[PDB]
Amino acid sequence: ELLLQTNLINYVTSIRPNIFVGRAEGSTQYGKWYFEVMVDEVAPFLTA
Amino acid sequence: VGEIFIYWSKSHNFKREEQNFVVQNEINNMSFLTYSVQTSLIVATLKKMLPIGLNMCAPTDQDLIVLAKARYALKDTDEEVREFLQNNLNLQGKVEGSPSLRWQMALYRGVPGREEDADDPEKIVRRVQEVSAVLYHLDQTEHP
Amino acid sequence: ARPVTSPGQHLLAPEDVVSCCLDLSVPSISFRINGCPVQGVFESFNLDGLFFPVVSFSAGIKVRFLLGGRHGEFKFLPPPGYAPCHEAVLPRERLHLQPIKEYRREGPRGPHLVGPSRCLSHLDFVPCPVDTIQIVLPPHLERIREKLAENIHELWALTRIEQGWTYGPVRDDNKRLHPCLVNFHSLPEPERNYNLQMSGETLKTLLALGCHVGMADEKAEDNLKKTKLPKTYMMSNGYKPAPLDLSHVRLTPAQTTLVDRLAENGHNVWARDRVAQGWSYSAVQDIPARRNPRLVPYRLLDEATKRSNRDSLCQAVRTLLGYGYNIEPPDQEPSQVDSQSRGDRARIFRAEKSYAVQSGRWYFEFEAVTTGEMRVGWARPELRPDVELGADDLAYVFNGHRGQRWHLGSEPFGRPWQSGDVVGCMIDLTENTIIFTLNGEVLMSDSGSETAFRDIEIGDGFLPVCSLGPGQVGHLNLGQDVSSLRFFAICGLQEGFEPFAINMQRPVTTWFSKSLPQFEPVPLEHPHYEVARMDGTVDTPPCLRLTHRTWGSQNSLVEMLFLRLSLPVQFHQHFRCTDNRDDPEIILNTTTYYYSVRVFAGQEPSCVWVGWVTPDYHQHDMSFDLSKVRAVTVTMGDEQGNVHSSLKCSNCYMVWGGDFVSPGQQGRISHTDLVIGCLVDLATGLMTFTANGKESNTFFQVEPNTKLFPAVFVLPTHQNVVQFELGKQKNIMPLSAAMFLSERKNPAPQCPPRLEVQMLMPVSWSRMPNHFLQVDTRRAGERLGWAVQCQEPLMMMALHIPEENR
Amino acid sequence: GVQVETISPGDGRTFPKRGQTCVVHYTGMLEDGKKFDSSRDRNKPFKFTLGKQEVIRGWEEGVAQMSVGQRAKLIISSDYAYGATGHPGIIPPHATLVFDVELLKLE
Numbered sequence A: 001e002l003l004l005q006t007n008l009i010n011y012v013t014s015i016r017p018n019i020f021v022g023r024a025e026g027s028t029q030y031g032k033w034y035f036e037v038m039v040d041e042v043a044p045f046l047t048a
Numbered sequence B: 001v002g003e004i005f006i007y008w009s010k011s012h013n014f015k016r017e018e019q020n021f022v023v024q025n026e027i028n029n030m031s032f033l034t035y036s037v038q039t040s041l042i043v044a045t046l047k048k049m050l051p052i053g054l055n056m057c058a059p060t061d062q063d064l065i066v067l068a069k070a071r072y073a074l075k076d077t078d079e080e081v082r083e084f085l086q087n088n089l090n091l092q093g094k095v096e097g098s099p100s101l102r103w104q105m106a107l108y109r110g111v112p113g114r115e116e117d118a119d120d121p122e123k124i125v126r127r128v129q130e131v132s133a134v135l136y137h138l139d140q141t142e143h144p
Numbered sequence C: 001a002r003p004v005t006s007p008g009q010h011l012l013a014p015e016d017v018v019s020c021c022l023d024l025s026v027p028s029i030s031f032r033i034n035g036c037p038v039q040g041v042f043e044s045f046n047l048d049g050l051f052f053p054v055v056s057f058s059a060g061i062k063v064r065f066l067l068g069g070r071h072g073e074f075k076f077l078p079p080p081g082y083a084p085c086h087e088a089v090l091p092r093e094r095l096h097l098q099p100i101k102e103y104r105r106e107g108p109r110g111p112h113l114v115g116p117s118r119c120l121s122h123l124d125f126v127p128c129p130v131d132t133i134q135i136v137l138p139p140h141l142e143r144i145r146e147k148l149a150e151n152i153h154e155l156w157a158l159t160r161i162e163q164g165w166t167y168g169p170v171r172d173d174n175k176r177l178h179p180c181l182v183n184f185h186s187l188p189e190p191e192r193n194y195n196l197q198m199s200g201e202t203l204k205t206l207l208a209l210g211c212h213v214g215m216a217d218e219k220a221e222d223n224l225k226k227t228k229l230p231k232t233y234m235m236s237n238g239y240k241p242a243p244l245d246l247s248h249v250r251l252t253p254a255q256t257t258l259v260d261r262l263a264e265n266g267h268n269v270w271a272r273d274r275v276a277q278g279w280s281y282s283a284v285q286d287i288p289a290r291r292n293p294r295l296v297p298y299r300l301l302d303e304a305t306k307r308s309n310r311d312s313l314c315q316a317v318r319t320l321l322g323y324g325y326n327i328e329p330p331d332q333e334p335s336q337v338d339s340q341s342r343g344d345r346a347r348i349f350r351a352e353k354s355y356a357v358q359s360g361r362w363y364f365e366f367e368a369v370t371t372g373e374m375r376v377g378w379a380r381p382e383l384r385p386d387v388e389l390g391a392d393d394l395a396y397v398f399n400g401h402r403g404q405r406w407h408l409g410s411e412p413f414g415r416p417w418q419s420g421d422v423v424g425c426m427i428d429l430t431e432n433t434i435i436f437t438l439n440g441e442v443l444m445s446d447s448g449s450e451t452a453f454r455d456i457e458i459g460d461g462f463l464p465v466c467s468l469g470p471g472q473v474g475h476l477n478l479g480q481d482v483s484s485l486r487f488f489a490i491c492g493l494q495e496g497f498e499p500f501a502i503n504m505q506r507p508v509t510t511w512f513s514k515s516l517p518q519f520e521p522v523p524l525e526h527p528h529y530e531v532a533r534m535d536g537t538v539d540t541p542p543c544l545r546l547t548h549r550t551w552g553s554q555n556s557l558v559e560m561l562f563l564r565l566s567l568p569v570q571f572h573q574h575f576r577c578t579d580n581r582d583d584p585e586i587i588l589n590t591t592t593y594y595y596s597v598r599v600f601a602g603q604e605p606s607c608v609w610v611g612w613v614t615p616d617y618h619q620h621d622m623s624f625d626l627s628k629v630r631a632v633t634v635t636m637g638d639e640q641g642n643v644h645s646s647l648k649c650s651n652c653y654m655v656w657g658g659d660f661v662s663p664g665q666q667g668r669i670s671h672t673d674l675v676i677g678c679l680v681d682l683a684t685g686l687m688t689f690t691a692n693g694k695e696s697n698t699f700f701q702v703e704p705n706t707k708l709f710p711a712v713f714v715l716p717t718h719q720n721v722v723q724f725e726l727g728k729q730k731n732i733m734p735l736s737a738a739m740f741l742s743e744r745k746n747p748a749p750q751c752p753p754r755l756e757v758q759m760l761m762p763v764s765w766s767r768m769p770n771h772f773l774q775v776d777t778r779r780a781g782e783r784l785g786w787a788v789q790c791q792e793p794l795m796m797m798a799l800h801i802p803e804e805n806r
Numbered sequence D: 001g002v003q004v005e006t007i008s009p010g011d012g013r014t015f016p017k018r019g020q021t022c023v024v025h026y027t028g029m030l031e032d033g034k035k036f037d038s039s040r041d042r043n044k045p046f047k048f049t050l051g052k053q054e055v056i057r058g059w060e061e062g063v064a065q066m067s068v069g070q071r072a073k074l075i076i077s078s079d080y081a082y083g084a085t086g087h088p089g090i091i092p093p094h095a096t097l098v099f100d101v102e103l104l105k106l107e
């Protein structure tokens, strides 16, 4: 809690489609949306 | 252009006549470029053309240029400065000693057409003497 | 991380399909794994913005977005009433996968620094037509309306027949049959009424915009004649478009600028009407479901539809001119978007402080991929991130969007660049000068001086620096690969200038101005804000008082100020199951801690929020109220109904001073100071507040192990604003006891040196990683969807501050 | 104690037996979430024999419960862990331990 702590961590990045939806009074956008993500390959521990 | 500038620097009458001509005719050296010695066309055209002169000289010739400028400060004539460089050709800077010469040589040899340059010691003395004289007289001009 | 029950629980593994559904009405977010419901939902979250699908990951994955339609084949049918996300792609954009708020991008010649992106707001989709109900149509304009509806219908039918539409009993695109293709007077009543209303709306909005319309020539109406049309243009039923000829009419540029506004207003009015009727937007048209591709505010509309509407409205104004009514364009009025603060709007990328050069002649290049707002030059190591480049004396830069040189202000210099132009920046510290060259040509000031800046004092040194505005891209070449420089040989090489990173075996590290607000100690020399540490007297506890130095004077800065005490109080890991002299046993055994905030007289309590903030608060909201506070309810339940947990998570726990302001006292300045006390039970995770010794209704519950910083959000209204009083109450321990282990059983209030006030700063310098994760995004196929791949590991050594959890 | 939650499934048939060496990768964290040990950091699997009391009761029972090729989270109480004494300098006294444990193979 006092001394600064150090550790090795993986870099993390985010990816999105250019799809933006919201709700506002008088808005022209639909309120219900749905999508899916299929996981083809994952390495549980590529690093530590 | 360097020879004309050298004559300008050497002759006092040339400077005074240029100053007169410009003053009476109300020329605008600033308009020409886009009075004070800096605005002088004689020195300005050189300042513009000098990079080509430096381009002739290889980076190894920097020390030889410094020595030639020292001789011109000694007021040695052009021919005896030429002989001085001819006999002192060996002093040309060593690329191994200084890292800067390495990355300067990279560009110098990369540029096409200059690989043949520096092959002739007479050519080397030509260029070093000329650029050194121009640089020396430019230094005297810029000094107040 | 809150565990959620699901059939066959397991961490996301190959051949797993995660179905995410967002219902913005509740609002709620729900998940399904391999078609099996996930017994957990998010709800009651903030709706101040636009939501997008997102996947976060480290190296070592290959996943695919399935967005429905042609951009992905759903493995499981969407739940009833939920639309595929591919329908949400805007008209002007093509669906693709992109990073989020990137400041760096790979490029052909090298990495590209990228400025902030412009993000649409949820309000940008609300059509806002100008208020025209107040305007009353003059009779002369009413009569013109009667004919304008018909003439607009004639032009509509002309365009329809030109593109090939033909009459029919029912409307179907493939059949190319159109029922409304008849005479306007014979048009069905609803469509005819709407057409009349729109025709009148054109004139009414013409009046509303400030434009003046008035009859000039009566004979023009009688002179106008409808154009005869061929038998091919003649309609199967027998109808023929009869648009009046306007070959003589001419339009002024101001009139065209007005036509643009008229088209925008018409489209916005139509969109508002359709929204009221219940229609919505969809990339694919679905008339039965009331989904349209064009039902979006004009600004976001597609270029072709914009041009069609502009042509229609230009023809309408031509018809008005033919009728002869003179139209006077109204003069443009000043308007400022002021979307964001300019100082923090532009991202500043500089070389690391250790690379500062104090001598020699140095050269580097900046290629402007875009033609917008960008500055490039040399900054001193102590450059501030919030201030614009060159606004202060720290940086000498060139802004070639308009051709200015920036240092302690802006002066005209050089010329603006076009796309792809390279600006070579040169610093000669032997002559104390800075030179800028555009495409190898030295930029000159108005006076004609070659040097952009002169008489520069060396100081600490100088660093390459650039600033990119929103949506701009620039390539910074520091000269590590000398052959990469494009104009160094043309200008700079012979002059003796040397590339900045010529002999550096590794790429130069850079730091960018990250716009994530961070709490930092109040500077001891802050021009406007002062914090005074006051010792605890017999009748007063230790105090930290804030005072506004420059109140009631020119240059005074009045803005929302977010303050927190540096040390947090941490709740216990396990919660408990189920005179005025402290009692020696109760005071020692209590787990409740108390601290108060005194809002001084003259400081409006309506402008004060007192409470606690988690280590996650990063909102620098100039217009702040408790509605802005982030808050989300995570609800765990059984496989059928039977909610098991309804936890609420938020980063800010506070009470408004307006609640404690008396209704009678409201509207009047109060002579009394307002003391708001905050009590936290570290064992039960219960948080309560008292106002002037009276228990308030507001109360909060937090999960075990939570860290909370005492906090105050205030808009200054007086020289004396607020005071953190670190005192205690009968049988409640002081705040120092919770903060410090050594004082855990000490009931005497204390304010050790470490405890101090910290203010929220909008921007801060942050190092740019030398290497970035390589992510490959590509459309695998129509059925496979889009694909994201990341296979190369990349790690860093992270230094963690325990108290701040950062 | 020890509570086991399956992060990833295993074969579901092969289970450790007494006197049988278990090879694992483990990442150890305190209940607060602070990491104190990890075999993946050393890049060498940890091998221990059941019934020899080489590891604490929490490992004994939790790993005995796990199946080959399974990744699981083990929550171990102080009594089933170092307990009141703790591990001076690493584990504070009376601390609950959370371990992410993958059972690679049995030898």
Ligand SMILES: Nc1ncnc2c1ncn2[C@@H]1O[C@H](COP(=O)(O)OP(=O)(O)OP(=O)(O)O)[C@@H](O)[C@H]1O
Pocket: C152, C156, C180, C191, C192, C194, C195, C198, C266, C267, C270, C294, C309
């Ligand atoms: N997308 C649009 N943009 C701008 N104005 C529109 C748009 N759609 C309709 N309008 C306005 O409404 C009128 C449409 O009248 P009407 O109700 O008879 O058309 P509709 O046959 O229902 O339309 P559509 O052409 O879509 O089949 C247009 O003349 C114009 O005044």
